[PDB]
Design an enzyme around this catalytic site. Structure first.
Site, PDB file in Angstrom:
ATOM      1  N   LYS B 209       1.132  -1.094   0.036  1.00 48.56           N
ATOM      2  CA  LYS B 209       0.217  -0.023   0.300  1.00 48.56           C
ATOM      3  C   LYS B 209       0.737   1.194   0.035  1.00 48.56           C
ATOM      4  CE  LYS B 209      -4.129   2.084   0.415  1.00 48.56           C
ATOM      5  NZ  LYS B 209      -4.135   4.010   1.733  1.00 48.56           N
ATOM      6  N   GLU B 215      10.033  -5.657   3.936  1.00 46.38           N
ATOM      7  CA  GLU B 215      10.829  -6.602   2.994  1.00 46.38           C
ATOM      8  C   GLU B 215      10.055  -6.272   1.839  1.00 46.38           C
ATOM      9  OE1 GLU B 215       8.700  -6.360   6.454  1.00 46.38           O
ATOM     10  OE2 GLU B 215       9.527  -7.269   7.509  1.00 46.38           O
ATOM     11  N   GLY B 269      -5.681  -5.922   5.646  1.00 40.39           N
ATOM     12  CA  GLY B 269      -5.119  -6.883   4.874  1.00 40.39           C
ATOM     13  C   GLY B 269      -5.083  -8.011   4.577  1.00 40.39           C
ATOM     14  N   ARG B 270      -5.172  -9.341   5.262  1.00 35.32           N
ATOM     15  CA  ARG B 270      -5.524 -10.314   5.841  1.00 35.32           C
ATOM     16  C   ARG B 270      -7.469 -10.356   4.999  1.00 35.32           C
ATOM     17  NH1 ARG B 270      -5.541  -8.269  10.427  1.00 35.32           N
ATOM     18  NH2 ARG B 270      -7.131  -7.725  12.144  1.00 35.32           N
ATOM     19  N   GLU B 356      -4.673 -13.476  13.247  1.00 32.44           N
ATOM     20  CA  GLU B 356      -4.046 -11.998  13.397  1.00 32.44           C
ATOM     21  C   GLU B 356      -5.512 -10.986  13.683  1.00 32.44           C
ATOM     22  OE1 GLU B 356      -2.656  -9.435   9.677  1.00 32.44           O
ATOM     23  OE2 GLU B 356      -1.287  -9.879  10.640  1.00 32.44           O
ATOM     24  N   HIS B 387      -2.292 -38.883   7.466  1.00 38.78           N
ATOM     25  CA  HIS B 387      -1.087 -39.692   7.861  1.00 38.78           C
ATOM     26  C   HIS B 387      -0.260 -39.026   8.232  1.00 38.78           C
ATOM     27  CE1 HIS B 387      -2.676 -42.552   5.601  1.00 38.78           C
ATOM     28  NE2 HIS B 387      -3.047 -41.782   4.668  1.00 38.78           N
ATOM     29  N   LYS B 512       8.932  -4.955  15.153  1.00 36.44           N
ATOM     30  CA  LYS B 512       9.380  -3.895  13.686  1.00 36.44           C
ATOM     31  C   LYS B 512       9.792  -3.222  14.247  1.00 36.44           C
ATOM     32  CE  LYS B 512       5.571  -4.819  10.784  1.00 36.44           C
ATOM     33  NZ  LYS B 512       4.506  -4.337   9.962  1.00 36.44           N
TER      34      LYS B 512
END
Lengths: 562, 562
Positions: B209, B215, B269-270, B356, B387, B512
């Site tokens: 944004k 990152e 964001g999510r 979150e 399994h 952060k």
């Protein structure tokens, strides 16, 4: 005999919890002597557990519990080949898979080591024949792509090591121009994934199943077999398919040359089988046997360290005790595996099976129902991926003890001119900060000091005092990947040994397999014979009717592939 | 007030004792209960009869939802009220999939025309791109697309992309094209994203944004260096685009600002895959019509969630049930178990969406909660997860499971002579496992089957363990949008009942900040030789060990992987 929760050492640790509740990691992390004592180191592995909710006295009281639970004796008996898997009457000797060619480790009265190396040297000779192009396909082309068909421990263990070796410079050089894929899910979508952009003429299939009767694996095995026959003819089965199995009859009746069968043993658990032919064979085809031999030697170095080192220096013992402390005394039901390495993207899914299938038990090894709960819930995503996913809860929601893993030397170093930090340094900046952020938190006084509005301070408060541990690895080559694998395999054994359970059986899988066979029969009777749905509760009957209400589009009993 | 202090909460607390007097092996024989504990909307059928509950439990959760003003909060979200009170933002991910003539106001301005202006811009760009008229620097049409982004810019689109990869319609429209995701700042992920790619046939989409994300932008500058090193500095505007609202940095980066696609602050964001965050890259791979059907799937659930009564409301039912499992039955974790390899990346997205959102410690007003909220979410697809960790779910800690099954297979496979089709073999587990968890296997049954008395304790299944089952008619773009919207609204419902803010994320700030401090120390020691200062003794040692290994390349020199 007696439940570990009935001993005085267990109760003494329960009283010790109240004193630790009075402590905060913000104050504890300033003690230089506390921090230095709560470390361990072996070769290229540095373990810092100073950010646990513990003092040196907590570790002292955990050592006494390990003595009361006879941890050392249970370890030695595993190494000596005794049938500690009591419910199955089996040895537990995945350490013999990476033992040197000289050692003597008996099981059923015979040294298993010369036979472990018999398959290794057979894998090596095959892999050299395969990789040098002398192994050819039906149309005369050298095979370069390998599909490994298997479920569970035949899939997760090998996938983890393969993903970690993919981007290591020396391994990636040896795997030039070669693909290794895994076909694990019986979902036919996974079959379509496995064969996408693949040529049957240049593909080798490795069917991994001890029994060669596994429903999921054998259906995929027969599926990809037909895929080979559909394109290359019925005689291409022998030169394009091999097996990791001991049922030599079914292997030949499948169409695979019995000499192309590579054996492992019943004292090799599924979740401990990556060091067997289950993993060594496909990995030696992709990366060569020298690379996988370095991987085995790394795991072998930890096996010696786990078996011989004193408890204050014993990294797998320290880890297993601290997890029992977090689980059974601090009350944390889950654990987060957070490696700050994209190469370790598939570490957490393997730890998931290794931990929960081993220790998700409700009774002791002697059949006494446990009054407490054992094996924790394990999950994880690599940093910084998982950092921008669920760290919100880890900081302000439920408390989850964290395994942070960092690597000093980058597999793929990157730096751009003018950058403040290299890319690997930017990644590791979070590896160093997050454990301190969890330990210290941020008080409302620190926030009000920073002029943050009063209506936001509650929402910006970090309580801190949340535990973590940090691995710092020298590098991530085959040797160090083997070390990391063995560390966790032994840590899970330590937790199960302290809890007094059986870490090496898995009876909880049978009921789902039984009912699935009952559903499969119901599906066959309805699809092929038109039988109604009968023998199920009203819910399952309804769901089966909805499913079967959509009839196939394919002519009756006619083969269809993607 | 506080939901834990209401009578409706206390009445549900005592109700737990009544449910504890029942066992699912008896409740599953009631046809009236099984039929009533279902819900259905279009091709989505929800069966929750295997919940540790009755229709009376559901009636009492409804009275908790009324005491929690659940319908009020849902209407305030849809209407555009800034219910994200800690950030003073609307919560309008539903507006990303609203039709053109919809009326959804935030600050009195209808946001719907601006949502479609971006969507129309995406479609026109995706047609020109997929037609080949959009060319790279060397004039070649672009085939592969790398989407750079973290968190919600990564997991949502990855989930949708993985589900569409094997849909027959979508896969056809995506033929010969690749869509990769570069999410980790770990330079190993950069090496993997560009593996076997040619810059002249590669387009990059930077999703951030602010265009300041640490990152993402380091990866964005890194892949920019990859392009300019091969094609020249001018090629940036032809090979790189952005999903961002910072037009200044986009132009300063080298990207044409008219190739920036907007989204808005009321998009979590999510919760952003339905914005240009997901719509733009997916439309490049699959074309805009395929994505519009995905958006139309999410829109169908939005209307259903907003208007349907609670007993037919699938997301409301799911949210109340998870709150029941979490806050009253005491289950701290939830398993997401889709029996579909195409849903391989569903659980990692739900992980962020749920943890979150609801991993919170204070109420929306700032009151610290006396209970714990958001559960721990994890999962693998069936039969993979089956399994791996099902051993613990059957015999260890109780974990409420979400089972998702699909009637029609994306990739049907059948071999002549097989007892069942490959998809039927998969679904046999989908129908069996929920019954296995509900019924268990008593030690009386085992003794009735001549099981040795010593093994009876180890083979016992207590049963009475809860699960729910989704049955979908198919898994095309439309049904993928439906499944996405269901889980987004379910997570909102749980946060509404708990009285928390499911839409802020302050818990990621402390990490952060301290990461920025470590970034300073790293630069100060790498480039200026400064000692380590300002850290506790543990972090000092870890930092000293890390910096002891010096960069292996000349100073301030550019190095790229492989």
């Amino acid at each position: 005999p007696a439940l570990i929760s009935d001993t005085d050492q267990w109760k003494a640790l329960q009283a010790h919890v109240g004193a630790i509740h009075k402590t905060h990691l913000r104050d504890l992390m300033t003690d230089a002597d506390r921090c230095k004592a709560m470390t361990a180191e072996f070769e290229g592995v540095f373990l810092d557990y100073s950010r646990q909710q513990a003092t040196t006295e907590t570790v002292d009281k955990l050592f006494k519990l390990a003595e009361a639970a006879k941890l050392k004796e249970k370890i030695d008996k595993m190494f000596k080949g005794e049938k500690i898997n009591t419910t199955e009457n089996r040895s537990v000797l995945h350490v013999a898979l990476r033992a040197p060619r000289d050692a003597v480790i008996n099981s059923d009265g015979v040294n298993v080591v010369p036979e472990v190396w018999a398959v290794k040297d057979k894998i090596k000779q095959f892999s050299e024949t395969f990789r040098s192009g002398s192994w050819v396909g039906a149309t005369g082309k050298p095979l370069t792509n390998v599909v490994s068909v298997g479920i569970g421990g035949s899939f997760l263990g090998p996938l983890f090591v393969h993903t970690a070796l993919q981007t290591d410079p020396e391994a990636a050089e040896s795997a030039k121009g070669r693909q290794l894929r895994f076909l694990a899910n019986v979902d036919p979508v996974d079959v379509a994934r496995s064969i996408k952009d693949l040529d049957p003429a240049t593909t080798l299939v490795v069917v991994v199943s001890k029994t060669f009767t596994t429903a999921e694996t054998m259906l995929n095995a027969r599926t990809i077999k037909e895929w080979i026959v559909s394109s290359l003819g019925p005689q291409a089965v022998s030169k394009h398919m091999i097996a990791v199995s001991t049922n030599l009859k079914l292997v030949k009746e499948f169409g695979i040359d019995p000499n192309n069968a590579f054996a492992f043993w019943d004292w090799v658990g599924g979740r401990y089988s990556v060091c067997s032919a289950v993993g060594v064979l496909p990995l030696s085809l992709q990366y060569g046997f020298p690379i996988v031999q370095k991987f085995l030697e790394g795991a072998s170095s930890i096996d010696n360290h786990f078996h011989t080192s004193s408890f204050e220096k014993n990294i797998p013992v320290l880890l297993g005790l601290l997890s029992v402390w977090n689980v059974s005394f601090l009350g944390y039901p889950a654990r987060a595996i957070l490696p700050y390495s994209q190469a370790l993207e598939k570490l957490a899914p393997h730890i998931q099976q290794l931990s929960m299938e081993s220790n998700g038990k409700g009774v002791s090894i002697d059949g006494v129902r446990l009054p407490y709960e054992a094996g924790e819930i394990d999950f994880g995503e690599p940093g910084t991926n998982g950092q921008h996913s669920f760290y919100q809860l880890i900081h302000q929601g439920r408390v989850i003890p964290c395994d942070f893993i960092g690597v000093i030397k980058s597999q793929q170093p990157v730096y751009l001119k003018g950058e403040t930090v290299s890319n690997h340094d930017e990644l590791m900046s979070n590896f160093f900060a997050q454990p301190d952020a969890l330990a210290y938190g941020k008080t409302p006084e620190q926030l009000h000091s920073e002029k943050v509005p009063e209506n936001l301070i509650s929402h910006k408060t970090f309580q801190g005092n949340r535990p973590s541990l940090s691995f710092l690895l020298s590098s991530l080559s085959a040797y160090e990947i083997g070390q990391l694998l063995s560390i966790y395999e032994h840590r899970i054994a330590v937790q199960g040994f302290i809890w007094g359970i059986n870490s090496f059986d898995q009876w909880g899988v049978e009921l789902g397999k039984s009912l699935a066979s009952t559903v499969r029969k119901q599906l066959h009777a309805s699809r092929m014979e038109g039988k109604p749905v009968e023998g199920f509760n009203p819910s399952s009957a309804s769901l089966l009717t909805r499913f079967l209400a959509v009839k196939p589009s394919t002519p009756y009993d006619t083969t269809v592939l993607p």
